[PDB]
PDB file of N, CA and C in Angstrom:
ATOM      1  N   UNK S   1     -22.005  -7.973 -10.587  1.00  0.00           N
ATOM      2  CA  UNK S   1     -21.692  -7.288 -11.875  1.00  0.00           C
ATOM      3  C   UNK S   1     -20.373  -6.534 -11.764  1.00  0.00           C
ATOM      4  N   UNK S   2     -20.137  -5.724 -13.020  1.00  0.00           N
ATOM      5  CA  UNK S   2     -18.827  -4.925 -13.064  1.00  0.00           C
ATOM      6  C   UNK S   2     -18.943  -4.194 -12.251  1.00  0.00           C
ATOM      7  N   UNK S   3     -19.481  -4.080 -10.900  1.00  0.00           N
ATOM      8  CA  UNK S   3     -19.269  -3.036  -9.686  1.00  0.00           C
ATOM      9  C   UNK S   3     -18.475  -2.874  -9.004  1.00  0.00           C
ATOM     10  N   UNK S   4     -18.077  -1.756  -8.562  1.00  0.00           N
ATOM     11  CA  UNK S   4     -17.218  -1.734  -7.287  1.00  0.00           C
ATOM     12  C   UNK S   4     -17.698  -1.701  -5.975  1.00  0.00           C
ATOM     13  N   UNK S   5     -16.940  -2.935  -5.012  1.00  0.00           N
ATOM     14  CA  UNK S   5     -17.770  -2.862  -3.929  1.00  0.00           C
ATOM     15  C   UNK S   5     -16.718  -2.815  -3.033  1.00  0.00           C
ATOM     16  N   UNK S   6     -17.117  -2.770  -1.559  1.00  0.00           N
ATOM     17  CA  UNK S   6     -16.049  -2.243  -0.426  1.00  0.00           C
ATOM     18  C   UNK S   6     -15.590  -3.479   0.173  1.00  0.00           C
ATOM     19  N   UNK S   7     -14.573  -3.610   0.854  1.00  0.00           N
ATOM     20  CA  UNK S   7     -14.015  -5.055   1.522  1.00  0.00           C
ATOM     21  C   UNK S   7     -13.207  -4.046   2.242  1.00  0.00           C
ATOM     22  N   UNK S   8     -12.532  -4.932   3.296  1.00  0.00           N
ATOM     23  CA  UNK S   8     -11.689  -4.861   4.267  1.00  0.00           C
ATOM     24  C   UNK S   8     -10.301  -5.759   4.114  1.00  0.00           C
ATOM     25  N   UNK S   9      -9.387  -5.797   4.914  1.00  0.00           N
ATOM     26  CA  UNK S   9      -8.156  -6.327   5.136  1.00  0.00           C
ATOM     27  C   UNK S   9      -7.807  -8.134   5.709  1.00  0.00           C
ATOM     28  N   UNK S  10      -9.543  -8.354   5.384  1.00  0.00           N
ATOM     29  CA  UNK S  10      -9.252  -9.638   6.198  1.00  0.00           C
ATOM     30  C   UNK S  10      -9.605 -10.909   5.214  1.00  0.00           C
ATOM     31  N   UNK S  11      -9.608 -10.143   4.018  1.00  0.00           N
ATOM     32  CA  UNK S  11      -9.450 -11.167   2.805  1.00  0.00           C
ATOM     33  C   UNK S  11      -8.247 -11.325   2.524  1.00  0.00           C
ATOM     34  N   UNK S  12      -7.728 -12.473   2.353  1.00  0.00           N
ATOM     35  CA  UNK S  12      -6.482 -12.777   1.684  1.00  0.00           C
ATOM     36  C   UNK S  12      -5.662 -12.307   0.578  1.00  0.00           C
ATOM     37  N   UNK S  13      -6.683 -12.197  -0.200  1.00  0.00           N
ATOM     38  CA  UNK S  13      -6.595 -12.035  -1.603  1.00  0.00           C
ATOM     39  C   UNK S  13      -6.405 -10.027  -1.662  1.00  0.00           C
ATOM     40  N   UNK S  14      -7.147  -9.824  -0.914  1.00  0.00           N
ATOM     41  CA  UNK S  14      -7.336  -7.985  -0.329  1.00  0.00           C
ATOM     42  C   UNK S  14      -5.323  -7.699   0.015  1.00  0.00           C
ATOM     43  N   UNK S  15      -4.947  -8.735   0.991  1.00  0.00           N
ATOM     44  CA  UNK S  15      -4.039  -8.186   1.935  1.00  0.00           C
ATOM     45  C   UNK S  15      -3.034  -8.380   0.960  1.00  0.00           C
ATOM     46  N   UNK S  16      -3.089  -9.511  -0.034  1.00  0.00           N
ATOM     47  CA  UNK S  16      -1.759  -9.693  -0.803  1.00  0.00           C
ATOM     48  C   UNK S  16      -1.699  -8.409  -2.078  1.00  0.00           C
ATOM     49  N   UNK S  17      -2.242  -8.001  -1.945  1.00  0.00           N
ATOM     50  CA  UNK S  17      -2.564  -6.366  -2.846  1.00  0.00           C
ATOM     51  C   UNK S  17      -2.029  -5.548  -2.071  1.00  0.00           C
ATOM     52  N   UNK S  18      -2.498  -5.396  -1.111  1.00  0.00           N
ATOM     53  CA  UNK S  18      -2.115  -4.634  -0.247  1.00  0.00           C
ATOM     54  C   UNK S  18      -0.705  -4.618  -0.611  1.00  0.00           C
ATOM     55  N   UNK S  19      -0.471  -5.324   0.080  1.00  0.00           N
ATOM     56  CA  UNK S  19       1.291  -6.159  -0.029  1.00  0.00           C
ATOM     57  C   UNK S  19       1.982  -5.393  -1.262  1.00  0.00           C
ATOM     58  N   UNK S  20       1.864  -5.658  -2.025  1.00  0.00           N
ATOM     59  CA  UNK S  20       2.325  -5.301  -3.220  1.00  0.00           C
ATOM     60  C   UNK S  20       2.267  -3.883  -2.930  1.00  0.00           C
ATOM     61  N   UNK S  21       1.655  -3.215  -2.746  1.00  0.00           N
ATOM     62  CA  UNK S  21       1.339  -1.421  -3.225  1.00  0.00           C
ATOM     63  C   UNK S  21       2.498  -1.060  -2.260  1.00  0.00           C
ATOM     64  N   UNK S  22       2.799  -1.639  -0.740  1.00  0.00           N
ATOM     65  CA  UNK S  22       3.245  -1.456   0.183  1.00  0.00           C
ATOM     66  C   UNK S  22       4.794  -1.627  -0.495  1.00  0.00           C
ATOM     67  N   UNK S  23       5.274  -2.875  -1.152  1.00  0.00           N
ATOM     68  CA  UNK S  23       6.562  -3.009  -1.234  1.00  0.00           C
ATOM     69  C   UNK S  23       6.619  -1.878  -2.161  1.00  0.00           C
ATOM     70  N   UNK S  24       6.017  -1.811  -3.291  1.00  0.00           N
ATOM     71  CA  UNK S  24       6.060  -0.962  -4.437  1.00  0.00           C
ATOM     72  C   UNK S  24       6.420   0.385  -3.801  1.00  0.00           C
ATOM     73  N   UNK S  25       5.582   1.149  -3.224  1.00  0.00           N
ATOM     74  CA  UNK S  25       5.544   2.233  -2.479  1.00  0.00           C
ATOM     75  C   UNK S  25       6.896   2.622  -2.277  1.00  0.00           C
ATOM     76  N   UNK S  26       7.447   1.616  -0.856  1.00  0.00           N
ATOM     77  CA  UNK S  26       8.567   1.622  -0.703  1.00  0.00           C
ATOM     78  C   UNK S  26       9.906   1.513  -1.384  1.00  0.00           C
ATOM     79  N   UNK S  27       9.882   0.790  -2.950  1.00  0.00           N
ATOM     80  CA  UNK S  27      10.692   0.524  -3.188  1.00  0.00           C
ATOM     81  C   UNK S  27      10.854   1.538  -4.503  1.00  0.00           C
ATOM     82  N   UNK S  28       9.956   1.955  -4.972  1.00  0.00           N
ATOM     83  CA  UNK S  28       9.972   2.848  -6.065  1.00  0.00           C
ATOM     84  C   UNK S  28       9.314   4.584  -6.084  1.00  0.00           C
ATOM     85  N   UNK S  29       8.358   4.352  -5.960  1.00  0.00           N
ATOM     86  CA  UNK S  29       7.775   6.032  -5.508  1.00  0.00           C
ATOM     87  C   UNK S  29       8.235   6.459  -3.656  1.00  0.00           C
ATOM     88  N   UNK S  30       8.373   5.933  -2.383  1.00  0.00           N
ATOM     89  CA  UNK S  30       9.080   6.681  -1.890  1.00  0.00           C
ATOM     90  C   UNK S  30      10.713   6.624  -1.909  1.00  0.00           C
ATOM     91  N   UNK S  31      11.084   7.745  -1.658  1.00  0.00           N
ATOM     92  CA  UNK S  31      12.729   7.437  -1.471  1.00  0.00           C
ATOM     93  C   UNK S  31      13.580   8.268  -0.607  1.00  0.00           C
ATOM     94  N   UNK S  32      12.766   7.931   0.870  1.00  0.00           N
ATOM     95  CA  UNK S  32      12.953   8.579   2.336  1.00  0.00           C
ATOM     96  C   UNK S  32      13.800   6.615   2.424  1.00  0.00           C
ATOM     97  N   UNK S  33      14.429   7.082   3.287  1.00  0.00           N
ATOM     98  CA  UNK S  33      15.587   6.417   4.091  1.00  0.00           C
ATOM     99  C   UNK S  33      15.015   4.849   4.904  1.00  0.00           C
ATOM    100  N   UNK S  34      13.804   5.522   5.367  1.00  0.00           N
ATOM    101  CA  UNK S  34      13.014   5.021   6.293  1.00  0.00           C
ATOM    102  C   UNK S  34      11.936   4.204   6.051  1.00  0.00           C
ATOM    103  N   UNK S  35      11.471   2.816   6.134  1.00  0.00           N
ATOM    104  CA  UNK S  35      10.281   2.370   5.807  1.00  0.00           C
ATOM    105  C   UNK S  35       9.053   2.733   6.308  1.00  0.00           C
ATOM    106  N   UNK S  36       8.481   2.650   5.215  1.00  0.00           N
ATOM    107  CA  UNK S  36       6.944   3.106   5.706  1.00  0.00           C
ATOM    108  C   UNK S  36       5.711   2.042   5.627  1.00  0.00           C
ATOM    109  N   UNK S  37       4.948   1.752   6.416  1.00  0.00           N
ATOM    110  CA  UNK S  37       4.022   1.343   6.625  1.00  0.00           C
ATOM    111  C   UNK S  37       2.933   1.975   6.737  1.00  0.00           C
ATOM    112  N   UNK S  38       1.103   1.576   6.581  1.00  0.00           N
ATOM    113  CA  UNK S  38       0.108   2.283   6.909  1.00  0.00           C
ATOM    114  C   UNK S  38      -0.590   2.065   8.200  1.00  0.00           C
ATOM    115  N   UNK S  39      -0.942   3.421   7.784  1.00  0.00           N
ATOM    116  CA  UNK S  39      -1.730   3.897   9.000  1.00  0.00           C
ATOM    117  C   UNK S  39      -3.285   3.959   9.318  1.00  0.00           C
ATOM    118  N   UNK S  40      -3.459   3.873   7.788  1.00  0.00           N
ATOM    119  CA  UNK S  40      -5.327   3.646   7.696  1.00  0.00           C
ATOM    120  C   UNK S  40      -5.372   3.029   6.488  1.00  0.00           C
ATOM    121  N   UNK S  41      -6.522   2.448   6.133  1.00  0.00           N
ATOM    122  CA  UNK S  41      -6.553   1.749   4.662  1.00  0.00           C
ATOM    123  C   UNK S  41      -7.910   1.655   4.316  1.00  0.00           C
ATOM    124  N   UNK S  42      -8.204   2.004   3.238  1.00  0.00           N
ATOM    125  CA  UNK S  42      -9.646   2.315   2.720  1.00  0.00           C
ATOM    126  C   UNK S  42      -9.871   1.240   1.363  1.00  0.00           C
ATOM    127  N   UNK S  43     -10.579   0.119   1.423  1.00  0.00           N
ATOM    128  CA  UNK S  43     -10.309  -1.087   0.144  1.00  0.00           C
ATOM    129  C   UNK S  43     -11.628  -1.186  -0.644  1.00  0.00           C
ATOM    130  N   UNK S  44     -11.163  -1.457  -1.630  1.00  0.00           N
ATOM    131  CA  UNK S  44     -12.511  -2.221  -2.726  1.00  0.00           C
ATOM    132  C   UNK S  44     -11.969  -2.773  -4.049  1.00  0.00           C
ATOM    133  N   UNK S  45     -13.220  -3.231  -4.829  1.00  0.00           N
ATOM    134  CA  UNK S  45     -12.353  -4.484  -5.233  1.00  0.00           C
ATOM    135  C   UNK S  45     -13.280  -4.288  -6.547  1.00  0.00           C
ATOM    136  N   UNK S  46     -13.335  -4.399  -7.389  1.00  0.00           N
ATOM    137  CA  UNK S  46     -14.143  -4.600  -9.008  1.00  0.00           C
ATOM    138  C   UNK S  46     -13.539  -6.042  -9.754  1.00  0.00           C
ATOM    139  N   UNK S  47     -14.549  -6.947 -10.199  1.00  0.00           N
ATOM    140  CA  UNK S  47     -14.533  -8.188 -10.961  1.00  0.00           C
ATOM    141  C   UNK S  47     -14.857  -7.600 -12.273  1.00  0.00           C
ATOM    142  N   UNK S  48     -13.695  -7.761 -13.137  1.00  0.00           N
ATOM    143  CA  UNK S  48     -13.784  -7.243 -14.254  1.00  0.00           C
ATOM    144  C   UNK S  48     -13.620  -8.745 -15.468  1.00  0.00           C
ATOM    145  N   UNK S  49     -13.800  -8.446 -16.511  1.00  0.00           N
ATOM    146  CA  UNK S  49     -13.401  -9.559 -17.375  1.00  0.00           C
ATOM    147  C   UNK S  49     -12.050  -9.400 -17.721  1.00  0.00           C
ATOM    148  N   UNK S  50     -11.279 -10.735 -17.069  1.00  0.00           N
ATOM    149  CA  UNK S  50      -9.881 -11.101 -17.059  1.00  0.00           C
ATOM    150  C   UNK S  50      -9.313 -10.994 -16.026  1.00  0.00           C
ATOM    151  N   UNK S  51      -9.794 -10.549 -14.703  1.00  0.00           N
ATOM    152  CA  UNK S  51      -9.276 -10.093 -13.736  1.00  0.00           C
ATOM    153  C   UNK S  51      -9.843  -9.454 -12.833  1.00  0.00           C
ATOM    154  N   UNK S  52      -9.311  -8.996 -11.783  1.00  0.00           N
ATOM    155  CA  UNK S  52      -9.856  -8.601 -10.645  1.00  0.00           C
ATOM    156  C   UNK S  52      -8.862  -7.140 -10.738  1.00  0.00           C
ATOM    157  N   UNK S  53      -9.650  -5.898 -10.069  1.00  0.00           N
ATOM    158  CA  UNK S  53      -9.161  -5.192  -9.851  1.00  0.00           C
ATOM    159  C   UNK S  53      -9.233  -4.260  -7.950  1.00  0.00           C
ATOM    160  N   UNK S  54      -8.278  -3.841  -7.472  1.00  0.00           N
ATOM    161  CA  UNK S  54      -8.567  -3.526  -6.146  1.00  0.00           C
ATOM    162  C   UNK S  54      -8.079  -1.864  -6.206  1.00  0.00           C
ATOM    163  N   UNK S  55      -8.675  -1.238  -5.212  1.00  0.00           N
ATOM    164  CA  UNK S  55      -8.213   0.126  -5.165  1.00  0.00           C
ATOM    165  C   UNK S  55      -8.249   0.452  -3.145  1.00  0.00           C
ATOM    166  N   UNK S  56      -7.169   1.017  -3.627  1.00  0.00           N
ATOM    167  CA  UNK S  56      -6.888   1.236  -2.171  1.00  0.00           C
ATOM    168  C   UNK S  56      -6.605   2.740  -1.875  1.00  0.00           C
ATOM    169  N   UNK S  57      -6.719   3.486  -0.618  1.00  0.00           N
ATOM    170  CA  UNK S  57      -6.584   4.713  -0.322  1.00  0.00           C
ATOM    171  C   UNK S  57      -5.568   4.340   1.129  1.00  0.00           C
ATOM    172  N   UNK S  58      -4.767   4.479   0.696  1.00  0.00           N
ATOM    173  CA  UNK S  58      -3.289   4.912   2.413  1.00  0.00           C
ATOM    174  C   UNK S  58      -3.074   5.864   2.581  1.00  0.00           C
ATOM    175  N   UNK S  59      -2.599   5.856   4.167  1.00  0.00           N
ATOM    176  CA  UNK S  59      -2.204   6.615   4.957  1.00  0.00           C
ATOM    177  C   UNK S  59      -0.859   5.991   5.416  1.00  0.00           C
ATOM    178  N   UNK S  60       0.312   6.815   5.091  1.00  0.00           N
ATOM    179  CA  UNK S  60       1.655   5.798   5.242  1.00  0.00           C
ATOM    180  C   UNK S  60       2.190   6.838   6.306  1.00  0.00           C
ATOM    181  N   UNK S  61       2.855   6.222   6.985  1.00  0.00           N
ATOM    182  CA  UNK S  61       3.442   7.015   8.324  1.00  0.00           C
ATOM    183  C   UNK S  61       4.988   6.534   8.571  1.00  0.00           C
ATOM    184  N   UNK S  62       6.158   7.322   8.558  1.00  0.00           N
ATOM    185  CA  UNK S  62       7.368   6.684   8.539  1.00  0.00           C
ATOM    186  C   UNK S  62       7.522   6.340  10.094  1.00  0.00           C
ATOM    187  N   UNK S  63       8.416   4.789   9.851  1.00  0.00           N
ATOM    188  CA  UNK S  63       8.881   4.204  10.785  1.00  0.00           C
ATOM    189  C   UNK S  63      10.451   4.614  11.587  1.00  0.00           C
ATOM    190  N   UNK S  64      10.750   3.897  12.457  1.00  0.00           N
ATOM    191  CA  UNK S  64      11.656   3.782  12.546  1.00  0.00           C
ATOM    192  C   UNK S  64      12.947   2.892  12.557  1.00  0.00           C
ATOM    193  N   UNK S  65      12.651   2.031  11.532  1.00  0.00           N
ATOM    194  CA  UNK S  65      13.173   1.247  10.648  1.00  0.00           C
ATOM    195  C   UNK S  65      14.016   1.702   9.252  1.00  0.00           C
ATOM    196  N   UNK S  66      15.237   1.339   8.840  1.00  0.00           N
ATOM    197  CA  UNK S  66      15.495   1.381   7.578  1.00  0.00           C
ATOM    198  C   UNK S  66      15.004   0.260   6.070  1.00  0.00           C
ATOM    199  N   UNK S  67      14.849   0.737   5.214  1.00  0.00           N
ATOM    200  CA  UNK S  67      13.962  -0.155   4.504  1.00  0.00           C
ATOM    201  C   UNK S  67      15.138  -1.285   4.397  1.00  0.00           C
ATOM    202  N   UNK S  68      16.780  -1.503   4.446  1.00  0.00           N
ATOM    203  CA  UNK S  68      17.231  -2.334   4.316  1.00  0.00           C
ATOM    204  C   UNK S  68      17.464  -3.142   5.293  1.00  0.00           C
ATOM    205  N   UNK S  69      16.214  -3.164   6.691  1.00  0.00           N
ATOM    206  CA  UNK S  69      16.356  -3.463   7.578  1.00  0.00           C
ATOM    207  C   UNK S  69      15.363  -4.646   7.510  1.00  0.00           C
ATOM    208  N   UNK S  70      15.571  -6.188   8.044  1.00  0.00           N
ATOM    209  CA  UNK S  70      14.938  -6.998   8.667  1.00  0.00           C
ATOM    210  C   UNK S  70      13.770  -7.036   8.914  1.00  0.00           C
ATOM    211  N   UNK S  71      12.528  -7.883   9.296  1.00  0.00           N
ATOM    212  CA  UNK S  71      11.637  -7.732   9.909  1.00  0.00           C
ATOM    213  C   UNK S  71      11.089  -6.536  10.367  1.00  0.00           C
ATOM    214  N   UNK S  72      10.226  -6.175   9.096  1.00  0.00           N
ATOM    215  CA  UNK S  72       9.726  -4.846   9.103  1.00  0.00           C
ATOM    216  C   UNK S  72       7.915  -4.839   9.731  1.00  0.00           C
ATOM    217  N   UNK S  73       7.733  -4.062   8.888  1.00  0.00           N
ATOM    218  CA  UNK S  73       5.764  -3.884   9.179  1.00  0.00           C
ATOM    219  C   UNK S  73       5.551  -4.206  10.617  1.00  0.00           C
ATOM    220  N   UNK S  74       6.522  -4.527  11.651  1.00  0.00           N
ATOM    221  CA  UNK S  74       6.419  -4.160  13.137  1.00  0.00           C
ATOM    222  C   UNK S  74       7.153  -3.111  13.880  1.00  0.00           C
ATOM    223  N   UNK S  75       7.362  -2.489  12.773  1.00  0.00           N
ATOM    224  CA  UNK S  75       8.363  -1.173  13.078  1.00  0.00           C
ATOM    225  C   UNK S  75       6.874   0.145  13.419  1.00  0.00           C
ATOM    226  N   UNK S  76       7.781   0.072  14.937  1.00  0.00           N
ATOM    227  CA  UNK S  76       7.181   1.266  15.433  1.00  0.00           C
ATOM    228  C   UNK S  76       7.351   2.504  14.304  1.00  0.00           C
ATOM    229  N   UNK S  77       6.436   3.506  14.721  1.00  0.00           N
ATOM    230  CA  UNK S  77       6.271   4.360  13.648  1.00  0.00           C
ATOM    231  C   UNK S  77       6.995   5.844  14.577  1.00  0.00           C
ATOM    232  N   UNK S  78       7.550   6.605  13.892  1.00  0.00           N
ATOM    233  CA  UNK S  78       8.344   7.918  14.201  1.00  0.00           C
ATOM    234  C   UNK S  78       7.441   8.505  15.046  1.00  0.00           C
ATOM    235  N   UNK S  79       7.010   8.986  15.971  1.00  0.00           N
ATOM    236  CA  UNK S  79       6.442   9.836  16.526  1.00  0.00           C
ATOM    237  C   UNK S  79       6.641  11.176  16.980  1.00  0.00           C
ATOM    238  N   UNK S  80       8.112  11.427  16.841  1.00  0.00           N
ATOM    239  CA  UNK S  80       8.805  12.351  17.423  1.00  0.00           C
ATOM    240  C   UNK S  80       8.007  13.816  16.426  1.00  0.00           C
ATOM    241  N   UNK S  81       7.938  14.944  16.820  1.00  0.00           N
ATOM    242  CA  UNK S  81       7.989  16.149  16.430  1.00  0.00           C
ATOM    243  C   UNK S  81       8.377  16.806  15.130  1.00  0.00           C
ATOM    244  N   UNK S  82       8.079  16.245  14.034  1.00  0.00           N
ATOM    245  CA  UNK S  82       8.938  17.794  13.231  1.00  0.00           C
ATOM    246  C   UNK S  82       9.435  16.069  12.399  1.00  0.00           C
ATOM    247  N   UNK S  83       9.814  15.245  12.822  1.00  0.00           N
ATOM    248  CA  UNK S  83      10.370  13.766  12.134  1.00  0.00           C
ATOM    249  C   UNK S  83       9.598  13.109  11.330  1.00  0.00           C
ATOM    250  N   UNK S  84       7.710  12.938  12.060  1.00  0.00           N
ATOM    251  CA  UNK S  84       6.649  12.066  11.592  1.00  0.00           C
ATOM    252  C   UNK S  84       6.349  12.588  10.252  1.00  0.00           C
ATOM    253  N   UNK S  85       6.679  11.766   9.238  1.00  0.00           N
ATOM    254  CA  UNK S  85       6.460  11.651   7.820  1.00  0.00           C
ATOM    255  C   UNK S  85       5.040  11.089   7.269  1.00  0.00           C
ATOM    256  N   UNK S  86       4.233  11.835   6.902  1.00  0.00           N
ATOM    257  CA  UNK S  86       3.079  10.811   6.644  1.00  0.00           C
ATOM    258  C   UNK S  86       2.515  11.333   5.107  1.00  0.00           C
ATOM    259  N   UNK S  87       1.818  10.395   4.910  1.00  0.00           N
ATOM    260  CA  UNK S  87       1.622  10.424   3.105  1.00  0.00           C
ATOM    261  C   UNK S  87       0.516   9.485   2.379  1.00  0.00           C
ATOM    262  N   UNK S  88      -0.914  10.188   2.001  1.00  0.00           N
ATOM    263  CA  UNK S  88      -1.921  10.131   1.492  1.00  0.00           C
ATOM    264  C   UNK S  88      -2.080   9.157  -0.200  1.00  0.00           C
ATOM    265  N   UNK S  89      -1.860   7.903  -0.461  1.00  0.00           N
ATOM    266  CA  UNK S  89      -1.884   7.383  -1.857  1.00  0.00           C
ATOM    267  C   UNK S  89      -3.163   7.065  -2.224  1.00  0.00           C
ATOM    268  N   UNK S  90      -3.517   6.839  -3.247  1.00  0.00           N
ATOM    269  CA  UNK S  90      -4.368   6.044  -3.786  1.00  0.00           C
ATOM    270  C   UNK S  90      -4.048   5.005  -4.906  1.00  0.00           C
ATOM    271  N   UNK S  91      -4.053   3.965  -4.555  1.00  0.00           N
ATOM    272  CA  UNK S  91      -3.490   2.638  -6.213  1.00  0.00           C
ATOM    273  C   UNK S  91      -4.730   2.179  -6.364  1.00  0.00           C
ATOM    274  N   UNK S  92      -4.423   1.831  -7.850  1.00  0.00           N
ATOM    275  CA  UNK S  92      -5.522   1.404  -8.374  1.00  0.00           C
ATOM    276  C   UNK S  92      -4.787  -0.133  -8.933  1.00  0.00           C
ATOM    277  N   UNK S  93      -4.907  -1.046  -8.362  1.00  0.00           N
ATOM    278  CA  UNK S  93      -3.980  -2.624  -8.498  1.00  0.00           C
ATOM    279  C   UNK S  93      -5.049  -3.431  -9.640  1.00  0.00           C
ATOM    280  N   UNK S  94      -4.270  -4.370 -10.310  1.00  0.00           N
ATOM    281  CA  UNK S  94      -4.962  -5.087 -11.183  1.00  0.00           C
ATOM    282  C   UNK S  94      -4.196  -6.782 -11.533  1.00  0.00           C
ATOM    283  N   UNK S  95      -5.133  -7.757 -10.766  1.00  0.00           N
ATOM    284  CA  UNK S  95      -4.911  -8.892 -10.849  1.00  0.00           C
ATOM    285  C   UNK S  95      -5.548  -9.777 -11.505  1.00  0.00           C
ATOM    286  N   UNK S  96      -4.615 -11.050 -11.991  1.00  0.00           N
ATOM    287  CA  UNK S  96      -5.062 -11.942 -12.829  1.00  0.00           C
ATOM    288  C   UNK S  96      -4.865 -13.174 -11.763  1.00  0.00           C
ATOM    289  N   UNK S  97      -5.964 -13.460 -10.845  1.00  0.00           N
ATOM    290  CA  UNK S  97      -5.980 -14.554  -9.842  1.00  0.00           C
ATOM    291  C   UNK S  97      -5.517 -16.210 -10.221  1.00  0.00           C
ATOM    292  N   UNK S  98      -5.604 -16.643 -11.107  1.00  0.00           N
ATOM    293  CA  UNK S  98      -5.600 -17.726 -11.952  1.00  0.00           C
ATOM    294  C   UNK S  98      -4.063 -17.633 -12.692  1.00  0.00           C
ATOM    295  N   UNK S  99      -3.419 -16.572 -12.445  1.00  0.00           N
ATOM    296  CA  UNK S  99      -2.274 -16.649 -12.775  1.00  0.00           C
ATOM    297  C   UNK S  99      -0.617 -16.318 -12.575  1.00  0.00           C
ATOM    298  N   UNK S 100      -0.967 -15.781 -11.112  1.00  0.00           N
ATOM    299  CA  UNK S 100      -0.212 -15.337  -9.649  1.00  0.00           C
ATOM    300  C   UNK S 100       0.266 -13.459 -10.849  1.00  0.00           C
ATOM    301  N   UNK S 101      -0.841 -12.980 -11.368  1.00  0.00           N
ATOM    302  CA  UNK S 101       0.268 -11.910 -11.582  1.00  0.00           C
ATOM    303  C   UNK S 101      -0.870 -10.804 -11.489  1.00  0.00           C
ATOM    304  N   UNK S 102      -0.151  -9.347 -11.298  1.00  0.00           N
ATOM    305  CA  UNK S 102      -0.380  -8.140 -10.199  1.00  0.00           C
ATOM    306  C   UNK S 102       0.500  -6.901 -10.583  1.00  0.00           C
ATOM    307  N   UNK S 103      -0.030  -6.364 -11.057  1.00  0.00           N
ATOM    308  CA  UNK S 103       0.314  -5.049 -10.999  1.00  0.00           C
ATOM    309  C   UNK S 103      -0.230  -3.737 -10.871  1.00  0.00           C
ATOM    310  N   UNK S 104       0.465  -2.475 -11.150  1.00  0.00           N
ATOM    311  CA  UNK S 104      -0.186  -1.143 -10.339  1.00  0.00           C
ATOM    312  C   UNK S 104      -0.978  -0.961 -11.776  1.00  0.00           C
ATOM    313  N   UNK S 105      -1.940  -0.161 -11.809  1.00  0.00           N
ATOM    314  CA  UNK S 105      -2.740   0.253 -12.929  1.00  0.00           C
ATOM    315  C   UNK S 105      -2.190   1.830 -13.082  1.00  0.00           C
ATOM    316  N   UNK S 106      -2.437   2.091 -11.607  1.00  0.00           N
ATOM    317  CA  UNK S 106      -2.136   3.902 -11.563  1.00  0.00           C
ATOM    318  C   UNK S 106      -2.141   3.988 -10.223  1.00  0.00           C
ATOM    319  N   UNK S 107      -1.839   5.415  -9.771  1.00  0.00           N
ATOM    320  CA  UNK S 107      -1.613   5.557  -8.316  1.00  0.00           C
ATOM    321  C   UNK S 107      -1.203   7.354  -8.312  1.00  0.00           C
ATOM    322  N   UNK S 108      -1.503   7.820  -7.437  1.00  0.00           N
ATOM    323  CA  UNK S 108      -1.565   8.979  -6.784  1.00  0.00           C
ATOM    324  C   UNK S 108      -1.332   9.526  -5.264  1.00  0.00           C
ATOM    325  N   UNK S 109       0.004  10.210  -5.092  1.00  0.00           N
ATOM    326  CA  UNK S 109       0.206  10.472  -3.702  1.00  0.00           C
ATOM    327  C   UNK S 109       0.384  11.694  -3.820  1.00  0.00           C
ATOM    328  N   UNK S 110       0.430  11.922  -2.293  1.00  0.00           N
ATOM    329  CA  UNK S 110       0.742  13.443  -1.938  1.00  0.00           C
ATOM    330  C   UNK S 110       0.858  13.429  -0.169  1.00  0.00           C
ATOM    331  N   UNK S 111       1.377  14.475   0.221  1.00  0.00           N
ATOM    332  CA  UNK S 111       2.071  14.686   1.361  1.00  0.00           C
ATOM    333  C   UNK S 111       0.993  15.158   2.087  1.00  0.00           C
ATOM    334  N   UNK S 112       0.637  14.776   3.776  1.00  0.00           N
ATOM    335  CA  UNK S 112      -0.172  15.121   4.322  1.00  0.00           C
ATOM    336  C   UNK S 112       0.232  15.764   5.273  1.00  0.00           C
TER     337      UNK S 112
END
């Protein structure tokens, strides 16, 4: 039914959401120097009529990578002192599977 239920990262369909919130993140709501990747990820997913919807809870931790940099998401993460950037979101994503299209519904961050 119209429920929301919990999944993990090892659905396809989960990770390419993911994906999205991640570039999004980076490319529009943060605007630190540095790419960020997560650090924890909390998923679920609601079958709605017309679409699928996913909600996710991150933990983003800055790298040490620039976002106009190459081969990212294997970028070690800042560890240093007083440098480590980290940051609490929640998106609420909404897909139309049957028709390659995806976008944010809403979303909420804040500094941890």
């Amino acid at each position: 039914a119209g429920g929301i239920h919990a999944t993990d990262l090892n659905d396809k369909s989960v990770q390419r959401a993911l994906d999205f919130a991640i570039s999004e993140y980076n490319k529009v709501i943060n605007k630190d120097e540095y790419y960020s990747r997560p650090l924890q990820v909390m998923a679920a997913y609601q079958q709605i009529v017309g679409g699928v919807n996913y909600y996710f809870n991150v933990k983003f931790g800055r790298t040490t990578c620039t976002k106009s940099q190459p081969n990212l998401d294997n970028c070690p993460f800042n560890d240093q002192p007083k440098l480590k950037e980290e940051e609490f979101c929640s998106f609420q994503i909404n897909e139309v599977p049957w028709e390659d299209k995806i976008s944010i519904l809403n979303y909420k961050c804040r500094k941890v």
